[PDB]
């Protein structure tokens, strides 16, 4: 099923694409995840124990 | 044992850097020094991972110096 | 922010070491890149693509007659460097006298190509009637594999690494500070080649 | 005796100055011997010496003026704790 | 050498073409022009809002279906494009039911405004919107820390998005020459090629301490 959403779109099916750095302009020798994840923030702040 | 070991992410590359193919481009050329073996590299004409044999020069501890030519990756001469 | 420099440090006789001012963030590591590269694979010079050597020559290393082997004479006389004039070939021959030590200042030289060093040997003769060698020049720009024949380094440098430090002056303290390492062969200057450099790459900004 | 008595509380382990706590991240521009270290921390660690800085190189003639200096949080304030 | 072909596939996104390049120039190009576009070229935007009924950013406002902090963040996301001068000052009205967009402030003959498809604030009630605005010049990011009076924060970067790909151009010469195009994807603000010509100044004037 998630190899046929990803197939849906102009996505690659592995999920797996070639990404380039942007230091050097020079291109990575493996293919990398690149997704969307839902990332939060947790309370322990860097003021409160500073 | 000392207590300064290098963790997994420069052990990864140096694992990743230490390796050798089969077939790769750039392989059996022989090089002068380990200045043209980075030269050879930073011009993306060979691969990380190829069987060249290089020339490299090291003294020797009881201090005598001395060359020879030994059958590496490119990796293991950078 | 335009940086106010650049100071070089000579530590060496043919290493340097550039010091720029703290630009601003971000600058420093591109002006690196595009210094590196062209400092690299763009500075046009003159280096030995081919020998012919007296003898059988049957293979790379199937040869006798002298106290090393030929694969060693090959790689000595691949690292040498050599400039000349602005003539594309050159043809020079190089010939021993004796049972000695050779350098590399024996070549029969021309009006119109010089030799950078003098003292740096290529083999060593222990034994009479000394082989003559044939060498051949041809311009090149970057590095060319083999792909009697030998590999080539036209590039003027032997070695360009750049480091991004940090540095701040007491207003700002996000500023990128560029530090160049370069190793020139000796037919010319560490700041000359910078300064080649930065006038290849402000032409090509400029045609564009 | 115990734990929470004054034997174990008071004498073995003490409360000190001239100390503060922080978070950690990882540095890798840094070198064996050396670490980072915050601006406002290090200034309020190195309090009593950048005073004494401060009233050598005759900024302020009190101790005073001083505090009011570090607390104004100028740029010789930020010299006199990088020096 | 000769020139750089403009493509246009869309009337906001552009395309670059520089043709012909000698071997180990498209990258570095590439990416320093990439660099520079991204994180070099100034802006406008809209700094500081004063609204006369809105004390600070926290209140309620009557006849607002969206509170202060929707109203701002949506007069950050516009863009603001502007032919001379270092600073200006944009007023708008608007009273009665119906949504407020971009297009209805007063605006002067050198501000020119985009026409905001993106709505602002949504009213209801018969409330008047008096609220003054205030654009400034600027260069990358700065916060509203480090500069009844509100304040905004702004990111002076007309460029959203820059890629590039070197491709191998078939032309007799002495070596295989490569080319490289260049997709720049604006917000409207900024041209393809004004941006690429302040990009050439900026690196001739980062350039020029050399020698």
């Known amino acids: 099923e998630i190899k046929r959403m990803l197939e849906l779109a102009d996505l690659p ?5 070639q990404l380039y750095d942007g ?19 947790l309370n322990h702040l860097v003021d409160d124990k500073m | 044992e000392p207590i300064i070991v290098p963790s997994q992410d420069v052990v990864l590359g140096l694992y990743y850097m230490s390796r050798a193919l089969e077939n790769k481009k750039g392989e059996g050329m022989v090089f002068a020094n380990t200045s043209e073996v980075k030269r050879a590299y930073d011009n ?18 009881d201090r005598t110096s001395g060359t020879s030519i030994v059958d590496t990756t490119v990796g293991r001469a950078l | 922010l335009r940086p106010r420099g650049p100071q070089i440090e000579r530590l060496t006789d043919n290493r340097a070491k550039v010091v720029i001012e703290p630009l601003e963030r971000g600058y420093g590591h591109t002006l690196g890149n595009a210094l590196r590269r062209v400092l690299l694979s763009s500075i046009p010079g003159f280096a030995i ?5 007296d003898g059988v020559l049957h293979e790379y290393t199937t040869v006798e007659g002298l106290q090393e082997d030929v694969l060693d004479v090959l790689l000595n006389l691949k690292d040498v460097a050599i400039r000349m004039h602005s003539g594309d070939s050159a043809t020079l021959s190089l010939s021993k006298q004796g049972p000695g030590t050779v350098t590399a200042a024996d070549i029969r030289t021309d009006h119109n190509v010089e030799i950078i060093n003098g003292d740096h040997v290529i083999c060593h003769l222990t034994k009479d009637t000394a082989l003559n060698m044939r060498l051949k020049i041809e311009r090149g ?9 030998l590999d080539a380094s036209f590039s003027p440098v032997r070695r360009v690494a750049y480091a991004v430090e940090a540095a701040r002056v007491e207003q700002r303290t996000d500023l990128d500070k560029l530090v160049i390492d370069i190793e020139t062969n000796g037919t010319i200057d560490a700041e000359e080649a910078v300064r080649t450099a930065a006038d290849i790459l402000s032409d090509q900004l400029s045609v564009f | 005796k115990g734990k929470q008595g004054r034997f174990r509380q008071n004498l073995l382990g003490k409360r000190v100055d001239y100390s503060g706590r922080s978070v950690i991240t990882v540095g890798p521009y840094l ?53």
């Not at chain 1, 302009?25 to 923030?41: I, N, Q, S, W």
């Not at chain 2, 993306?44 to 501890?61: C, G, M, P, S, Y």
């Not at chain 3, 693509?49 to 050597?53: G, H, K, L, S």
């Not at chain 3, 720009?141 to 024949?149: D, E, K, R």
């Open chain 3, 49 to 53: 693509t081919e020998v012919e050597i």
């Open chain 1, 23 to 41: 230091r050097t302009g020079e291109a990575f020798d493996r293919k990398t995840t690149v997704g969307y994840m839902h990332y939060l923030k």
């Open chain 4, 31 to 83: 070198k064996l011997h050396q670490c980072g270290l915050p601006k406002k921390m290090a200034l309020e660690l190195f309090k009593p010496f950048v005073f004494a800085k401060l009233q050598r190189r005759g900024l302020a003639t009190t101790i005073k003026a001083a505090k009011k200096l570090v607390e104004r949080e100028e740029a010789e304030v930020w010299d006199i704790l990088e020096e």
């Open chain 1, 13 to 17: 099916q592995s999920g797996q694409t």
């Open chain 3, 141 to 149: 720009f970057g590095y060319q594999p083999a792909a009697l024949m």
């Open chain 2, 44 to 61: 993306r004409v060979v691969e990380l991972h190829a069987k060249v044999k290089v020339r490299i020069t090291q003294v020797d501890v």
